[PDB]
Scaffold this active site. Structure first.
Site: not given
Ligand SMILES: Cc1cc2nc3c(=O)[nH]c(=O)nc-3n(C[C@H](O)[C@H](O)[C@H](O)COP(=O)(O)OP(=O)(O)OC[C@H]3O[C@@H](n4cnc5c(N)ncnc54)[C@H](O)[C@@H]3O)c2cc1C
Ligand SMILES: [Cl-]
Ligand SMILES: Cc1cc2nc3c(=O)[nH]c(=O)nc-3n(C[C@H](O)[C@H](O)[C@H](O)COP(=O)(O)OP(=O)(O)OC[C@H]3O[C@@H](n4cnc5c(N)ncnc54)[C@H](O)[C@@H]3O)c2cc1C
Ligand SMILES: [Cl-]
Lengths: 521, 521
Positions: A345, A348-349
């Site tokens: 993350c 966090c933590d």
């Molecule tokens: C372990 C961990 C803990 C975290 N904890 C926090 C927290 O507590 N608070 C916080 O604010 N943020 C946290 N984050 C960061 C947060 O999760 C991300 O910023 C957020 O999920 C980004 O959203 P997104 O919609 O852009 O993309 P993502 O959540 O990555 O979603 C993108 C989606 O598209 C899919 N995808 C990828 N490529 C393709 C393709 N070619 N075709 C179709 N689908 C596809 C992916 O598999 C996924 O399901 C954390 C991250 C991690 C790794």
């Molecule tokens: Cl975070």
């Protein structure tokens, strides 16, 4: 030859095998053949589950070895040296054969196991090549998953002769059933999209008959879900396709910065996003991976999104929201202590380790700023930088070097994460200069290595920066009219859930504006 | 003289008086005095609660009249003509005197009622001046609220002589107790900040003794609350000051686009934002209005925020999140039907009118796009544009003019919103060309006139665009180092709650970065 630290790492990795693995070699009298024989014998002594057998009578290259389970002829084959930069490819081939799961999309794995047809792949690599590993690993995984797919990864340094006979101009170079398949960096998704082009399953044929969408959103993590809610609220025909609904949120255990919710769980927030999207008329498509974007030939025309499954969706506007993969240290212990001390993350933590010791992996501006912040609340911080000098701006270095409770180790690479089965308790790393291995006791590890935007499939189609982020402006407009992007796969400065949902909304409103300006009345 | 539509509007407004109002004139034999006499007599016949009396013996300008309640000498006074662009100033002076409440911040109203000291203000205006109304209205409200504050608004066209004797170079021109006070556009907050500069109350003296903050966030709607949570999570000393916690969200009745929450209420979401901020160590300061930003004289120094109450807060970094005021039509009926048909939300309530008729006020790109969208789901749409031609881009005009269920009225200004006590039922508007008044039955009115960012207090201190929005980049950095901005008061393209919270988070992370780079170790 295998050196001492590679043997140490391999032993730790192999303690995890759950099924027996057999290395079957086919050798000749060459010096390289003797190295391979010694290598396999050395690997087999590191684990009770690994055995070495040699059959010099098989009609395969010499030297080469098959990685399989006893009683089968299934698995990838390495011809020549599997060390150097392919060491990790060899480690993965052993672990997957021994029952370790892949971290690839589950729908992608399922499509690979269902591939009909025989495909014999061969990939040429060099031990010093940096992009061959991903390609070799992708094809090896396919051979472990489906007996109808064979793969032989060939060391160009050993079969130098073949590389000139077949015109190989660069590595990695892939052939399938005797013909050139691809060259350069390729992801597993892109390889699967190119090889499984036959009569698509029921799911694909169905997708092909859907009417064109007013907006199709690619990726269903928080940015895409937010875009879907905003678009459907405008009453336009909305499609949301993704591998697995919820994105990174789904597997997150504790979330305390999703504004207005003091504390929730990844599964519940993902469920709430799903309920918000289901409150409207959105065609939600799951278990699909976008593999290609084909831009509209005219304004007001249709953009096309090809999927790994062979289908083609079409739409008047597109919102790319595929997120990013978060880089790992790739060392034994890391996976096992994934939710028990190893933290990825970005913000966090930290208060979790007050009074304890931690490490920060990565010496760029984020790493150094993460150390400075943690130094304020934890008993101690050890920061490991891979390069011989921190990459952070000078001003940050100067401040981190003035903090008594922080130690900076340069020229270092983590080699292992230690635990007691319940929590992390330390890590070992290697001094790149001298090869020595050092240990450090601690309760937390903050990996701040980097991000890998899921945008390789868009190469050349939309402009991206050097790190792979899709370039956008304040309205989330990309370099192609009618295509927008939101979330972690873009150049947005910070990667957070609440930031991504706000970007998804912006992108949906911009796409709505674009639609009213170009759709026929 | 009062024309027929001004009499019609005034009659409708005055039906609302709850307390009797008396207009007391002091006149001479001049022609202008005769006009004022006829004007006041004409206003008094429009309402049972308004009476006209004349006392030509008082030691005040001639002609002039006092607007007060019977039995008192309290209230504002107009010297000369109160028509032209001051018509609305006259209407407000009548309504406030008759018991109508101000829409100004409650903490600001309270500070005005508590002003100690005698202040005799005089403002010179001209009937054609566009920025005098706000100034005249601000001072008139102060005189209605506190008997120790007098105000006489002087028509420069009638007292032409005074304007040359006192060096008045432009209007509006304000004097207080005989001395120049200010010229040009001024808000009530800025006037109060400049006049109430004495021994501040307990609240102010207390604020002055607070230690400097690591980040002080100005404004506590969703963007500021989000910034507060993100900053406190980094463990820095965080201050959040605002007029009233919750911003526009607090008074919103139904919210269905705050991502992950299918439907909630303004009071509950505001409460949830408050609970998230209270989960951390944030010094929340309520009932304060920032009136001036004084930038740090050196890098790593302190920025200062002065308040209307006379206090001075200081901090290493600042996040401006003061939002915007949403423009009104300013016509009788509008306030009363505020939550019963008149809609200001930028992207909500359209499906609410399926099968019904509505109007959209405003012909810019947002107005025309709002009409096109509503046309898709409502039975009918009437669009009123003030100018003689739509301002929207051509392509939008072309499409809106091709929709059979939409009518475009150019050169028009709304004059009244009609209802049956429960819901809106129509509106009347005036044809600017001919003066004629037309009516149109309908159930909804979508006001899409414009936004007024709450940034006048930052004039000249941070760069803003022509509309008053603070210019920011992707990191929410402003034109001043260490000062960031987020939400509706910035150039962010769309004004929504989920967008504002995401911006607040970005701004907090940028301020944190700035802090680590400049704070002494
Ligand atoms: C372990 C961990 C803990 C975290 N904890 C926090 C927290 O507590 N608070 C916080 O604010 N943020 C946290 N984050 C960061 C947060 O999760 C991300 O910023 C957020 O999920 C980004 O959203 P997104 O919609 O852009 O993309 P993502 O959540 O990555 O979603 C993108 C989606 O598209 C899919 N995808 C990828 N490529 C393709 C393709 N070619 N075709 C179709 N689908 C596809 C992916 O598999 C996924 O399901 C954390 C991250 C991690 C790794
Ligand atoms: Cl975070
Ligand atoms: C009637 C209505 C309905 C709406 N419905 C929705 C909806 O359903 N969904 C949606 O997404 N959006 C909606 N919106 C828009 C949404 O409310 C705004 O986009 C959002 O509140 C902006 O948040 P903000 O933090 O930037 O500013 P705001 O909420 O405006 O808050 C700024 C705060 O700062 C205070 N302030 C101002 N000047 C000063 C100063 N000088 N010193 C100190 N404090 C100051 C303000 O009084 C206020 O409390 C609606 C808007 C309106 C007007
Ligand atoms: Cl809205």
């Amino acid at each position: 030859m295998l050196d001492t630290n590679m043997k140490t790492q391999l032993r730790a990795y192999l303690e995890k095998l759950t099924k027996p693995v057999e290395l079957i070699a086919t050798l000749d009298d060459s010096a390289k053949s003797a190295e391979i024989k010694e290598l396999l014998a050395e690997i087999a002594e590191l684990s009770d589950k690994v055995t070495f057998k040699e059959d010099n009578t098989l009609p395969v290259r010499k030297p080469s070895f098959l990685i399989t389970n006893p009683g089968s002829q299934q698995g990838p084959r390495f011809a020549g040296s599997p060390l150097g930069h392919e060491f990790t490819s060899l480690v993965l081939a052993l672990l997957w054969t021994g029952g370790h799961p892949s971290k690839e999309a589950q729908s992608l794995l399922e499509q690979i196991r269902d591939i009909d047809g025989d495909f014999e792949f061969e990939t040429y690599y060099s031990l010093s090549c940096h992009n061959c590993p991903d390609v070799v690993q992708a094809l090896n995984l396919m051979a472990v998953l489906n007996p109808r797919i064979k793969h032989t990864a060939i060391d160009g340094g050993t079969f130098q002769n073949e590389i000139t006979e077949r015109n190989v101009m660069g590595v990695p170079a892939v052939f399938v059933n005797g013909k050139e398949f691809g060259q350069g960096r390729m992801t597993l998704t892109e390889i699967v999209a190119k090889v499984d082009t036959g009569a698509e399953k029921r799911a694909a044929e169905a997708l092909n008959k859907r009417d064109a969408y007013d907006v199709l959103i690619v990726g269903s993590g928080p940015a895409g879900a937010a875009a879907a809610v905003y678009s459907a609220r405008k009453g336009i025909r909305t499609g949301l396709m993704g591998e697995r609904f919820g994105g990174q949120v789904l597997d997150t255990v504790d979330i305390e910065n999703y504004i207005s919710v003091p504390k929730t769980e990844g599964q519940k927030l993902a469920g709430a996003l799903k309920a918000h999207v289901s409150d409207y008329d959105v065609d939600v498509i799951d278990s699909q991976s976008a593999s290609k974007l084909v831009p509209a030939a005219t304004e007001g025309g249709l953009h096309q999104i090809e999927t790994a499954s062979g289908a083609v969706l079409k739409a008047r506007s597109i919102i790319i929201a595929t997120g990013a993969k978060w880089r790992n240290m790739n060392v034994p212990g890391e996976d096992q202590y994934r939710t028990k001390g190893v933290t990825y993350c970005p913000h966090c933590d930290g208060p979790l380790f007050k009074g304890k010791r931690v490490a920060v992996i990565g010496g760029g501006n984020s790493g150094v700023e993460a150390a400075i912040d943690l130094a304020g609340i934890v008993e101690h911080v050890t920061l490991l930088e891979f390069a011989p000098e921190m990459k952070a701006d000078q001003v940050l270095q100067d401040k981190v070097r003035s903090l008594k409770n922080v130690d900076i180790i340069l020229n270092a690479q983590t080699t292992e994460v230690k635990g007691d089965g319940s929590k992390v308790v330390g890590l070992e790393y290697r001094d790149r200069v001298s090869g020595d291995i050092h240990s450090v006791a601690l309760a937390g590890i903050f990996v701040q290595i980097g991000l890998l935007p899921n945008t390789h499939w868009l190469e050349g189609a939309l402009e991206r920066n050097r790190m792979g982020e899709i370039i956008i402006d304040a309205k989330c407009e990309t370099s192609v009219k009618g295509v927008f992007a939101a979330g972690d796969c873009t150049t947005v400065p910070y990667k957070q859930i609440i930031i991504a949902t706000g970007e998804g909304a912006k992108a949906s409103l911009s796409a709505f504006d674009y639609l009213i300006r170009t759709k026929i009345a």
